[PDB]
Each structure stands twice: as C-alpha cells, then as structure tokens.
Amino acid sequence: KVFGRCELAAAMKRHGLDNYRGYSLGNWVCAAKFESNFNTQATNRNTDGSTDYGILQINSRWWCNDGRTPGSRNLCNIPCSALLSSDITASVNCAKKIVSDGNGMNAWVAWRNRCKGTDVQAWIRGCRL
Ligand SMILES: [Cl-]
Ligand SMILES: [Cl-]
Ligand SMILES: [Cl-]
Asked: Ligand 1 centre and the CA of 30: distance in Å?
C-alpha cells in the first residue's frame, strides 16, 4: 500500500508514535517519506548483504529475519516480510524498539540527512488528526 501523507500521519498517531521518545509526529512522517516514499512494499539491498524493508526501511542485519543475512540478529522477533504489510503495526512496534536503543532517530540515515533540523511540522500541516 502507498499511503497518503495525512493517512499515514493518522495511522502513526493511532499507534502511539506522536512524541514517542520525544519525536513529534512530523519526524516520523518525514522519515517514512524519504525512506520509502510512503510505500509499505519498499525493499532495498545494502552492500553488506542485508536488506531494508517497508515503510521505515528496517534493516535485516539487526531487526528482523529474512533467512539470507548471515549472522544477523532478529531483535524485533519477526520475519522481515511482516514489515511489508499494508497494516503498519509490525513496523511501528519495531521502530519503537529501534528508537529506544541509544541513537534515537539517527538510526534512520534519511532522517538524519533530510529531516533532522528542518521544519518537520510541515509534514502534518493540513491533516485532521
Ligand atoms: Cl510535528
Ligand atoms: Cl536478521
Ligand atoms: Cl533521542
């Protein structure tokens, strides 16, 4: 599923991400826009053989099992395919563990390079939340 901006903001809000660990909702919308273009089916392979999955491009080296990333951990305890669903629940729950790990949203390279320090509230302007 390809979400619209406001539709995704509302789904994220309902799943408890607005101000989760101090990150306002617009941070999470901005990250999803530049990680996946709001497409739950996005996959991208990394140089190390790991793969990133879903709307938040969660990486198979630490966070999920895809059966092809040798010596990887599965810290969210889920198959990586569950992250590609039209229901963002699994992605959201895993993201909450990632952002709690110590580096906050810096774990998402596109957040750090494209969202961090910008006016992220613009990502939720116009939305009925
Ligand atoms: Cl915001
Ligand atoms: Cl893994
Ligand atoms: Cl933080």
From this structure: 9
State the CATH architecture for 1-129.
Orthogonal Bundle (1.10)
Residue 120: Cβ within 10 Å count: 19
For ligand 3, an ion, list residues with CB under 5 A: 104
The residue extents of the domains of the chain are: 1-129
Tokens of 83: 């992250």
Instruction: Determine the Cα angle at 123 with ends 108 and 6, to 5°.
Output: 105
**Residue 123 burial (CB < 10 Å; 0-12/13-18/19+)?**
buried
Paired strand residues for 100: none
Resolution of the experimentally solved model in angstroms:
2.0
Give the ligand at the shortest distance from the Cα of 98.
3
Distance 106 CA to ligand 3 centre (A): 8
* Integer CA distances (angstroms), 30 to 45, 70, 76, in order: 21, 31, 23
Experimental method: X-ray
DSSP 38: T
